Amino acid sequence: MLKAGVHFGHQTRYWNPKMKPFIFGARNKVHIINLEKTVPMFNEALAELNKIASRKGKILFVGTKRAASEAVKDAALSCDQFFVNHRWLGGMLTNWKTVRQSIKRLKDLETQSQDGTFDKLTKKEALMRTRELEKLENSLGGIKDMGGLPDALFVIDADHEHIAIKEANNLGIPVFAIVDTNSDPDGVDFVIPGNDDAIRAVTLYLGAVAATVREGRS
Amino acid sequence: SLSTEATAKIVSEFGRDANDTGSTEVQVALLTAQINHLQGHFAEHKKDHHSRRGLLRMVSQRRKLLDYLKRKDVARYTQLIERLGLRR
Amino acid sequence: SMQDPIADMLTRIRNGQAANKAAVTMPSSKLKVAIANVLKEEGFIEDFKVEGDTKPELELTLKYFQGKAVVESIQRVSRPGLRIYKRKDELPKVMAGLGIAVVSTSKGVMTDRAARQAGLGGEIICYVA
RNA sequence: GCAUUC
RNA sequence: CGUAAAGCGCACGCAGGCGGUUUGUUAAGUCAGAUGUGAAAUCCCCGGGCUCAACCUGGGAACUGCAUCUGAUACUGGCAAGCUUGAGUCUCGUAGAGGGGGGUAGAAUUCCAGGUGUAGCGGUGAAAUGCGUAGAGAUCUGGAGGAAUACCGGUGGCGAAGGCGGCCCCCUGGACGAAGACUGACGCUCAGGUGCGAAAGCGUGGGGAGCAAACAGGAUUAGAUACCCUGGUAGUCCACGCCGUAAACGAUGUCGACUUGGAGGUUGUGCCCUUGAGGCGUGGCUUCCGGAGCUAACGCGUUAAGUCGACCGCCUGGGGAGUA
Ligand SMILES: [Mg+2]
Ligand SMILES: [Mg+2]
Ligand SMILES: [Mg+2]
Ligand SMILES: [Mg+2]
Ligand SMILES: [Mg+2]
Ligand SMILES: [Mg+2]
Ligand SMILES: [Mg+2]
Ligand SMILES: [Mg+2]
Ligand SMILES: [Mg+2]
Ligand SMILES: [Mg+2]
Ligand SMILES: [Mg+2]
Ligand SMILES: [Mg+2]
Ligand SMILES: [Mg+2]
Ligand SMILES: [Mg+2]
Ligand SMILES: [Mg+2]
Ligand SMILES: [Mg+2]
Ligand SMILES: [Mg+2]
Ligand SMILES: [Mg+2]
Ligand SMILES: [Mg+2]
Numbered sequence: 001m002l003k004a005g006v007h008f009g010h011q012t013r014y015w016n017p018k019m020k021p022f023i024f025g026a027r028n029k030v031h032i033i034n035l036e037k038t039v040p041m042f043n044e045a046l047a048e049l050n051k052i053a054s055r056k057g058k059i060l061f062v063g064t065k066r067a068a069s070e071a072v073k074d075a076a077l078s079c080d081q082f083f084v085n086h087r088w089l090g091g092m093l094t095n096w097k098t099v100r101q102s103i104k105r106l107k108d109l110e111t112q113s114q115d116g117t118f119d120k121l122t123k124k125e126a127l128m129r130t131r132e133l134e135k136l137e138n139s140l141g142g143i144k145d146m147g148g149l150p151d152a153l154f155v156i157d158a159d160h161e162h163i164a165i166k167e168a169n170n171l172g173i174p175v176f177a178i179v180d181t182n183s184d185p186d187g188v189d190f191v192i193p194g195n196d197d198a199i200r201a202v203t204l205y206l207g208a209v210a211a212t213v214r215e216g217r218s
Numbered sequence: 219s220l221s222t223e224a225t226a227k228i229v230s231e232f233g234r235d236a237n238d239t240g241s242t243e244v245q246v247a248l249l250t251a252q253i254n255h256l257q258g259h260f261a262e263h264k265k266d267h268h269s270r271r272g273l274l275r276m277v278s279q280r281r282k283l284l285d286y287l288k289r290k291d292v293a294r295y296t297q298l299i300e301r302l303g304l305r306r
Numbered sequence: 307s308m309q310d311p312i313a314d315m316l317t318r319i320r321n322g323q324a325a326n327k328a329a330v331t332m333p334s335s336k337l338k339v340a341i342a343n344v345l346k347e348e349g350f351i352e353d354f355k356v357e358g359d360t361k362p363e364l365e366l367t368l369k370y371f372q373g374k375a376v377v378e379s380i381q382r383v384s385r386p387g388l389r390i391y392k393r394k395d396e397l398p399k400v401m402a403g404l405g406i407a408v409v410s411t412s413k414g415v416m417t418d419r420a421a422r423q424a425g426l427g428g429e430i431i432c433y434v435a
Numbered sequence: 436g437c438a439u440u441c
Numbered sequence: 442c443g444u445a446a447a448g449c450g451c452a453c454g455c456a457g458g459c460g461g462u463u464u465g466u467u468a469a470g471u472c473a474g475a476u477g478u479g480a481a482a483u484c485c486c487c488g489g490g491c492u493c494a495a496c497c498u499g500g501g502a503a504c505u506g507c508a509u510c511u512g513a514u515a516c517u518g519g520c521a522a523g524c525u526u527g528a529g530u531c532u533c534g535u536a537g538a539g540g541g542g543g544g545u546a547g548a549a550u551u552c553c554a555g556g557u558g559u560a561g562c563g564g565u566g567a568a569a570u571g572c573g574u575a576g577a578g579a580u581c582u583g584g585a586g587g588a589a590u591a592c593c594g595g596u597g598g599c600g601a602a603g604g605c606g607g608c609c610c611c612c613u614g615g616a617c618g619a620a621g622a623c624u625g626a627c628g629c630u631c632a633g634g635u636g637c638g639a640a641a642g643c644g645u646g647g648g649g650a651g652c653a654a655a656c657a658g659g660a661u662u663a664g665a666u667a668c669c670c671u672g673g674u675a676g677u678c679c680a681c682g683c684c685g686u687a688a689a690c691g692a693u694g695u696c697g698a699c700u701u702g703g704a705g706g707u708u709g710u711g712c713c714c715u716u717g718a719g720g721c722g723u724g725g726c727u728u729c730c731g732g733a734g735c736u737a738a739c740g741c742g743u744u745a746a747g748u749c750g751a752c753c754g755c756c757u758g759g760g761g762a763g764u765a
Contacts, residue, residue, distance in 0.1 A: 239531035240624030268540035272614035286627040307629040317749040
């Protein structure tokens with residue numbers, strides 16, 4: 001529901017003209033979002049997300065900025081949904097079949113560590129090869145068990161994650177995004193105007209969807 | 219261009235009163251006064267081409283106004299040219 | 307200088323539709339109102355209004371369907387430099403009848419279909435699809 | 436510093 | 442028709458083309474119907490006849506035209522009366538290398554005269570021609586004359602374009618803003634025409650410091666009618682006339698309307714005002730980057746090369762040739 005924070009936007013210099021409808025005014029030289037318009041669209045976002053959630057669909061969280069990199073992972077632990085916390089590899093969805101073998105390599109790396117077959121005297125097995133696990137995990141950690149294209153895309157920034165939006169649009173996957181004043185609309189089917197980088201803003205966002213998904217999943 | 223006192227004198231002479239400045243008679247009379255006044259200027263400064271271009275605009279503007287007045291009312295046009303002693 | 311006010315009315319509609327503008331306002335005239343009335347009847351424009359007496363201003367309420375402009379295309383046909391008149395049998399039909407052509411007949415301004423039904427020709431104003 | 440041609 | 446061929450160098454403008462808005466009238470254009478005519482054949486449509494076809498033939502349609510008659514009045518035009526939003530005049534201000542004329546100032550170069558002073562100076566990649574013991578260069582004093590205006594100076598300003606930089610005066614053009622008043626379509630464009638139009642060049646008469654085609658010498662080089670060096674005439678400057686050409690370029694004609702934005706420069710103006718080398722608005726001009734759209738692409742992008750209207754100019758493979 002409506003509460004403190006989130007309303008804060010960015011400077012009027014970097015505003016996107018396409019977002020004129022969702023700006024309430026230029027307060028202290030920085031645009032502030034119209035909350036009365038955000039709640040209807042936002043409430044629609046959870047309702048749509050709940051509907052697909054009841055269909056056992058797979059939701060994907062896309063957060064790359066350091067401010068929310070750990071936040072998305074926390075939601076991915078509160079619910080069984082998938083996420084991307086670090087750089088979005090170009091083509092994670094367009095050529096998913098190409099990325100499948102990369103996931104399989106991570107599984108093999110994970111296995112070799114579990115049963116201790118990697119504890120060979122050589123540093124090559126001990127150090128060089130095991131350093132690939134965290135390199136792959138930090139980028140493919142939350143997508144390991146997706147097993148296919150997501151049924152919906154959730155994005156914290158529509159411009160910082162413009163690559164992810166393009167892939168989802170190409171594949172026809174519905175896109176939900178926390179679109180900011182400076183961000184580019186028309187690439188997201190469901191737009192949630194508001195702040196994208198404030199810590200207290202995102203946590204409410206991914207926290208809200210992380211909840212309604214659980215009720216929809218049942 | 220033209221002194222305010224001289225401009226006021228022409229307005230009251232040709233127009234209905236001191237406030238009727240838009241009348242074709244006032245506009246034509248004002249242009250004629252400046253054109254005649256500038257005759258001495260170009261007698262001495264023969265190659266003041268840049269200012270002469272402005273003078274030709276007044277001549278062209280006066281001709282357009284005179285033709286409009288002639289079309290609108292011939293009788294008024296005939297009286298005006300007689301008073302100003304032009305169209306020779 | 308402005309020499310074809312009708313083209314300005316059509317241009318404003320075309321530019322406004324491309325800009326996703328809710329409505330377009332322009333100086334009003336009897337011919338513009340007559341053309342606007344035909345557009346409103348055919349469903350191309352939601353509504354139109356005239357405000358002011360000394361300097362009336364004509365406002366047109368544009369309409370959109372599925373987020374795209376209803377008026378796919380609108381072009382002036384008869385122009386001050388070249389005016390076009392058509393007989394009853396020569397009345398054109400836009401997009402094989404899906405569109406309409408606004409015709410200024412002796413009985414007023416009406417679509418090509420109306421003029422054809424009435425059996426009266428006249429000046430072709432514009433094609434709007 | 437100058438330094439052509441196939 | 443920015444770069445592929447193609448926007449006159451830029452303007453003013455007659456003929457011509459086009460023209461805001463309201464009422465009445467006219468019914469020329471336009472539109473409807475009828476009448477006369479539009480020969481026959483031919484073409485076309487439905488039939489008939491040569492064994493079929495070609496071919497022949499009946500009727501219709503067609504001959505998109507012209508003329509008259511009767512009507513229609515929306516649009517265009519004519520006529521009459523209007524209206525203010527286009528355009529224009531007036532009042533108060535602002536900025537500017539806008540133009541013409543006259544005067545004047547300082548720095549510097551060259552030259553002339555004199556003093557001090559002594560063997561180099563000048564120049565190049567190197568060198569030489571050249572200047573100098575007849576006293577150069579350097580340095581100081583005074584005088585003469587010409588040309589251009591350091592700093593300010595800034596993708597700053599002004600002008601139709603070309604173009605216009607010290608300062609002062611005289612004459613003078615245009616632009617822009619503030620409200621208010623006035624005229625009431627007087628407008629836009631423009632073949633021909635006319636005016637202006639860098640530099641070089643030409644004519645006459647002056648002037649001539651610097652610079653410098655031509656020319657001369659010294660170098661360079663296989664040669665060097667060049668680049669480099671030392672000299673140097675026309676010219677560059679002024680007066681008046683002529684020439685009318687430039688990559689005269691934004692390689693982008695003029696006018697008007699419409700269409701998301703961001704950051705600057707410049708010049709007016711409104712308002713909040715004690716919490717000023719402040720806060721929010723509204724005009725003119727102008728630079729840069731970019732959205733839609735557009736474009737062959739590059740790119741353009743509210744100052745369009747986007748979306749439209751009016752008028753003019755111009756292009757139709759290369760070369761020959763903008764030549765005979
Ligand atoms: Mg070329
Ligand atoms: Mg070319
Ligand atoms: Mg008219
Ligand atoms: Mg008639
Ligand atoms: Mg016949
Ligand atoms: Mg037969
Ligand atoms: Mg009329
Ligand atoms: Mg001409
Ligand atoms: Mg010269
Ligand atoms: Mg000479
Ligand atoms: Mg001489
Ligand atoms: Mg030389
Ligand atoms: Mg030429
Ligand atoms: Mg030039
Ligand atoms: Mg050219
Ligand atoms: Mg040009
Ligand atoms: Mg003109
Ligand atoms: Mg741009
Ligand atoms: Mg020749």
